[PDB]
Amino acid sequence: ALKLEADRLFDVKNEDGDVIGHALAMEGKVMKPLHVKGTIDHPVLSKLKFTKSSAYDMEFAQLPVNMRSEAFTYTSEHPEGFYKWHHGAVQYSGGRFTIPRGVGGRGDSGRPIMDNSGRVVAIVLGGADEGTRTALSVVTWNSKGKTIKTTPEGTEEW
């Protein structure tokens, strides 16, 4: 099991070059959280005309015809149980995606949450600590393709 995969997740950097978030190729578009003010570390992608979507904290551009194959697949069906992301397991219960407290922070915006078949279930934007866990503010799309934004009380943008 060599983890050999396409180029789908890219870094967004600040003025001095600190990675402050992430941008992803998914369903024919490059998208990154709007609140992440930096540049996409990619020679081709960082020259595209991005379209803003303030209501959803999203910013997207059309993937070059070529790259369109190197992308993630979205899925609007997320049963309760466990999911996976960069740091480990993400739990989905009670309409909310949570991770352990003290795990997420700056740099985690734009990271996808995914199921075992490898489909993206949601995109992280920030988190609101509640007890021994953190409730994530994510962007998801419903079966009819409608973008939805769930933001817990006290959410801090990552």
Please return the burial class of 77, using the count of CB atoms within 10 Å of its CB with bins 0-12, 13-18 and 19+: exposed
Measure Cα distances from 24 to 38, 81, 82, 141, 155 in Å: 14, 24, 22, 15, 22
- Of the candidates 57, 80, 82, 69, which has an alpha carbon nearest to the alpha carbon of residue 140? 57
Whether 63 and 98 map to the same domain: the answer is no
- Of the candidates 40, 38, 35, which has an alpha carbon nearest to the alpha carbon of residue 57? 35
Last residue of a domain, one of 33, 57, 72: 72
Whether 80 and 50 map to the same domain: the answer is no
Resolution in Å, one decimal place: 3.1
Domain that includes residue 61, residue range: 8-72
Last residue of a domain, one of 17, 47, 72: 72
Report yes or no on 3 lying in a domain.
no
| Neighbouring residues of 151: CB distance < 8 A, sequence distance ≥ 6 | 125, 126, 128, 137
Report yes or no on 133 lying in a domain.
yes
Longest CA span, the chain: 46
Whether 115 and 62 map to the same domain: the answer is no
User: For the chain, how far is it from start to end, CA to CA, in angstroms?
Assistant: 32
Last residue of a domain, one of 72, 92, 115: 72
- Of the candidates 158, 154, 139, 149, which has an alpha carbon nearest to the alpha carbon of residue 29? 139
Write out the catalytic residue numbers.
35, 57, 109
Report yes or no on 32 lying in a domain.
yes
Whether 81 and 156 map to the same domain: the answer is yes
Report yes or no on 31 lying in a domain.
yes
- Of the candidates 15, 16, 4, 52, which has an alpha carbon nearest to the alpha carbon of residue 31? 52
**Domains: count for the chain:** 2
CATH of the domain at 142: 2.40.10.10
